[PDB]
Design an enzyme around this catalytic site. Structure first.
Site, PDB file in Angstrom:
ATOM      1  CE  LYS A  25     -59.381  20.577  33.497  1.00  0.00           C
ATOM      2  NZ  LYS A  25     -58.684  20.596  34.813  1.00  0.00           N
ATOM      3  NE  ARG A  39     -52.145  34.035  35.344  1.00  0.00           N
ATOM      4  CZ  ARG A  39     -53.401  34.359  35.627  1.00  0.00           C
ATOM      5  NH1 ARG A  39     -54.079  35.145  34.804  1.00  0.00           N
ATOM      6  NH2 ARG A  39     -53.979  33.895  36.726  1.00  0.00           N
ATOM      7  N   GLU A  57     -66.230  33.501  31.969  1.00  0.00           N
ATOM      8  CA  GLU A  57     -65.348  32.635  32.736  1.00  0.00           C
ATOM      9  C   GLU A  57     -64.315  31.978  31.830  1.00  0.00           C
ATOM     10  CG  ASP A  58     -60.991  30.682  33.965  1.00  0.00           C
ATOM     11  OD1 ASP A  58     -61.932  29.955  34.347  1.00  0.00           O
ATOM     12  OD2 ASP A  58     -60.142  31.158  34.749  1.00  0.00           O
ATOM     13  CB  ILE A  59     -61.586  26.374  32.033  1.00  0.00           C
ATOM     14  CG1 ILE A  59     -61.817  24.935  31.567  1.00  0.00           C
ATOM     15  CG2 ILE A  59     -60.802  26.395  33.333  1.00  0.00           C
ATOM     16  CD1 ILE A  59     -60.544  24.199  31.209  1.00  0.00           C
ATOM     17  CB  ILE A  60     -66.816  24.717  33.656  1.00  0.00           C
ATOM     18  CG1 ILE A  60     -67.511  26.081  33.649  1.00  0.00           C
ATOM     19  CG2 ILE A  60     -67.540  23.738  34.573  1.00  0.00           C
ATOM     20  CD1 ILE A  60     -67.566  26.740  35.005  1.00  0.00           C
ATOM     21  N   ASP A  61     -64.311  23.199  35.517  1.00  0.00           N
ATOM     22  CA  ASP A  61     -63.751  21.898  35.867  1.00  0.00           C
ATOM     23  C   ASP A  61     -64.762  21.094  36.676  1.00  0.00           C
ATOM     24  CB  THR A 117     -64.956  28.581  40.967  1.00  0.00           C
ATOM     25  OG1 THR A 117     -63.954  27.802  41.634  1.00  0.00           O
ATOM     26  CG2 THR A 117     -64.575  30.052  41.045  1.00  0.00           C
ATOM     27  N   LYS A 133     -58.099  36.458  36.900  1.00  0.00           N
ATOM     28  CA  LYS A 133     -57.524  37.001  35.673  1.00  0.00           C
ATOM     29  C   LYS A 133     -57.583  36.011  34.518  1.00  0.00           C
ATOM     30  N   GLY A 175     -67.086  23.059  38.759  1.00  0.00           N
ATOM     31  CA  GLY A 175     -68.185  23.991  38.892  1.00  0.00           C
ATOM     32  C   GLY A 175     -68.356  24.615  40.260  1.00  0.00           C
ATOM     33  CG  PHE A 220     -53.881  21.866  34.550  1.00  0.00           C
ATOM     34  CD1 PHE A 220     -53.188  23.025  34.256  1.00  0.00           C
ATOM     35  CD2 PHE A 220     -54.711  21.848  35.658  1.00  0.00           C
ATOM     36  CE1 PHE A 220     -53.317  24.144  35.056  1.00  0.00           C
ATOM     37  CE2 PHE A 220     -54.843  22.964  36.462  1.00  0.00           C
ATOM     38  CZ  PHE A 220     -54.144  24.113  36.160  1.00  0.00           C
TER      39      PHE A 220
END
Ligand SMILES: O=c1[nH]cnc2c1ncn2[C@@H]1O[C@H](COP(=O)(O)O)[C@@H](O)[C@H]1O
Ligand SMILES: O=c1[nH]cnc2c1ncn2[C@@H]1O[C@H](COP(=O)(O)O)[C@@H](O)[C@H]1O
Ligand SMILES: O=c1[nH]cnc2c1ncn2[C@@H]1O[C@H](COP(=O)(O)O)[C@@H](O)[C@H]1O
Ligand SMILES: O=c1[nH]cnc2c1ncn2[C@@H]1O[C@H](COP(=O)(O)O)[C@@H](O)[C@H]1O
Lengths: 189, 192, 186, 201
Positions: A139, A171, A108-112, A116, A68, A114, A158
Site C-alpha cells: 500500500k 476470499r 504475506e498478503d499485503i503491507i498497509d 503486523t 489466511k 507494517g 481497500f
C-alpha cells in the site's frame, strides 16, 4: 523493491468484462489486478527469489504463510519456485510452514502500515539464520518500511479477492478488486 | 465412492521422462500420478462436489484443509470449485478453514490408509454441531482386507505403496515434488 | 464493447515480467500481460457460447487466420471447449485454417479493417449459413461482433502478433520502441 | 529409452471420472492419455529439444506443424518451449509454419526444420514429407511426434522426439481425428464400436 506500480491514475477494469463470483454481483467497483496478472508477475518474482537465495549460498529456505490472507499467493508462488528450481537444475530444498537457524521467507498478503509484519519479523528474530519478507501487494501511504520482495504497489484503497478479506469475506473471488460502498455496507457489521 | 483405480499391476512411469526436482535424483522409484492428471481429475471432482451441494440447498460450504499434506490438493481443488461455481452462475459461498458450527464442512485431506486420522477428525467435527460433514480425499490406499470406511469424494485409489509428492511427505520431505511418486528404499533410508 | 486501454496508460515495464532474452532492448512496455488475456478469454468464450445458444446452432466452425491468431485460436478453443464441457451442452466445433453452409466464427488477431473485409468478401463464394467475426484486439470506427481489448493506435507485438514475421514467440502483448522498429525493418 | 511406453496390459481410465465432451458420451471406450499428462510430458520434451538445438548452436529453428492433426500438440509444445527458453536466458529463435503440402517459399534452405506431427503408425505419411523436405537443401530435418504406435514387427522408423508409445489401437482426441471428428475432445481416447459406426466413411 521495484515492482509493478499501479498509479492512482489507473481506473481499473470493470467487472462486467471478466469472470467474477456471481455471489458478489453488486459489491465490486472494478477489477484492479486480474488473476493471470498475478500469475505472470509471480513468475518473474519466483526467478528473483531463487537467484537471490543462490547469490547467497543458502542450504535451504522455509516459506512462512500467514493464514489466511496469503494462501493463494503461497500456492501460486510455490508453483513458480518449484518450476524455476526445476528448470534451472538447482538443488534448493524448500519447506512450507503455516502460522496464524534457518532461512525464513515470510509469505504475506499485503503491507498497509507494517505493524503486523514487524511483530512477526521481530518474533522470528527472537536466533534465526535469516528473515526475509515477500508481499504480494504493498500500500502506498509513504510507509517507512518495504518488504524484500514486492509484487505490486497499489493506491491507498481497500482491495479484496485472491484470499484478501474484507471482514472475513470476498476470499473466494478470482481477481483482485476494490469494493464499493454497497458491498461495504452489506459485509461490515 | 467410485474413482480412478490404480491397479496393482500398474508399473508406473519412470521419472526420467517427466520433470523431477533435482534433489531427489536417486530417491524416486517411478511416477505414479502426473500433476496434470491430478488436475484433470480435480475438474470432475469439482463438478461432482458442486452439483451435490446444489442438489441440496447448502447456504455455504466450509472446506477444512488438513495440513500439511493437503495444501496443494486444497489449492487446486479450490481453483476447480471456484471455476465451476462461476461457470454455472450459481451463488454458493465457500470458506476455508485450516487444521493440522452449523455449517457444511468438507474435509480436504491428502491420503487415507487405515482411517484413524479421518475418524478422529470427523469425531471432533461431530461435537461442534455441524450442518453436514463430508470428506474429500485425493488418494485412498487399497488395503487387504479393504478398509471399512470410504470418503464421499475420492480422486484416485492407489496400491498399498508409500507415495510422496504433491505435498505428500515422508518425514516432512518430498513435499516440493510436482507429481505423486513411489519412493525407493534408498530414499526411505536417506530420510529417517 | 470490450476492455478499453486508454491512451494515458503507459503500460508496464518489461523488466517486471518474464520476457524472452531475444528482445532485450526492442520493447518499450507491455500493454496486456499474458495472464490478463487468459482471464478475459473466459468471459469472451462465455459470450460466444451464449450467442450460439440464444439461437439453436447445430455446429460452429472457427476460422483461424494464420499466422497471427494461432495462440488466440488455441486459448479461445480451450475456453470454448471448457465452457461447452462445463455446461453439458452438445455444441460441436470444427477449425478451418469445400466445407460450406456452416456457421463461421472468424478468429482474427487485430483490426483499419481492410483485411477482415477481404475475409468476409471471400466467404461469399461458398455462401456460409451464418458469419460472425471475433477479434482479440482493436486499435483506435468499426467493430466486430466479439472484441476483447481496445488498444491505442500504437504498434503491438507478441502473442503471435508480428512485425515482419518477428516477435511472435513473445509471451505478453508489448509495445516496441523505434530502435526495435528499425532493427527489424523489411 | 525413447519415451513413455503405455504397455498393452494398460486398460485405460473410464471416461466417467474425467470431463469429456458430452456429445461423445457413448462413443468413447476409455481415456488413454489425459490432457494434463500430455502437458507434463511436453515440459520434459521441451527441455530435450531446447538443449539439443543449443548444444549445436542452431542459428534458426522452424517448427512446421502438420495441420489439423498436430495443432494442439504444437500449441502446448510452443508453450513449453518458450517457457523453458524464458527460464534459462537462452536465445533460441524459433519460427512457426504450417502444412497440410501447402507451404512453399522456397527459402526453407539452410534452415533447421523441426517437424511437428500428431502420430506415427506405418511411417509412409511422414516419409513422404521428410523426402520432400530433404530436397530443399535444409541444414537439418528432425521430427517431433506426440504418439507412436507399437507395430508388429516394430516400425523401421522412430522419430527423434517422441512423447508416448501407445498400443496398436486407434486413438482420437486432442486434435486426433477419426473421419474429421473427435477433434474437440480434450483427452486422448480410444473409440469403441458405436463411435466407429457413428462416424463411418
Ligand atoms: O486493503 C486491504 N485489504 C485486505 N486486507 C488488508 C488491506 N490492507 C491491510 N490489510 C490487512 O491488515 C492487516 C494489518 O496490516 P498493517 O496495517 O500493515 O499492519 C493484515 O492482515 C493485512 O492483510
Ligand atoms: O503413502 C503415504 N504417503 C504419504 N503419507 C501417507 C501415506 N499413507 C498415509 N499417509 C499419511 O497418513 C495420515 C493418515 O493416514 P491413516 O491414519 O493411515 O488413515 C495422513 O496424514 C497421510 O499424510
Ligand atoms: O500493432 C501491430 N503489430 C503487429 N501487427 C499489426 C499491428 N496492428 C495491425 N497489425 C496487422 O495489420 C494487419 C491488418 O490490420 P488492419 O489493417 O487493422 O485490418 C493484420 O495482419 C494485423 O496483424
Ligand atoms: O490412431 C490414429 N488415430 C488418429 N489418426 C491416426 C491414427 N493413426 C494414424 N493416424 C493418422 O493417419 C496418418 C497415418 O500415418 P502413417 O501410418 O505413419 O503413414 C497420419 O496422418 C496420422 O496423423
Amino acid at each position: 523493491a521495484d515492482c509493478v506500480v499501479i498509479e492512482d491514475s489507473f481506473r481499473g477494469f470493470p467487472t462486467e468484462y471478466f469472470c467474477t463470483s456471481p455471489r458478489y454481483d453488486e459489491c465490486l467497483d472494478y477489477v484492479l489486478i486480474p488473476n493471470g496478472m498475478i500469475k505472470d508477475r509471480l513468475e518473474k518474482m519466483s526467478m528473483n527469489i531463487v537467484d537471490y537465495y543462490e547469490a547467497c549460498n543458502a542450504t535451504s529456505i522455509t516459506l512462512m504463510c500467514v493464514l489466511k490472507g496469503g494462501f493463494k499467493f503461497l500456492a501460486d508462488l510455490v508453483d513458480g519456485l518449484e518450476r524455476t528450481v526445476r528448470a534451472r537444475g538447482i538443488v534448493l530444498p524448500m519447506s512450507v510452514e503455516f502460522v496464524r537457524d534457518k532461512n525464513v521467507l515470510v509469505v504475506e498478503d499485503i503491507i498497509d502500515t507494517g505493524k503486523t509484519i514487524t511483530k512477526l519479523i521481530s518474533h522470528l528474530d527472537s536466533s534465526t539464520k535469516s528473515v526475509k519478507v515477500a508481499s504480494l501487494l504493498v500500500k502506498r501511504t509513504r510507509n517507512d518500511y518495504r518488504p524484500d520482495f514486492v509484487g505490486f504497489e497499489v493506491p491507498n484503497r481497500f482491495v479484496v479477492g485472491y484470499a484478501l478479506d474484507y471482514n472475513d469475506n470476498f476470499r473466494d473471488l478470482h481477481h483482485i478488486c476494490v469494493i464499493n460502498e454497497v458491498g461495504q455496507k452489506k459485509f461490515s457489521v
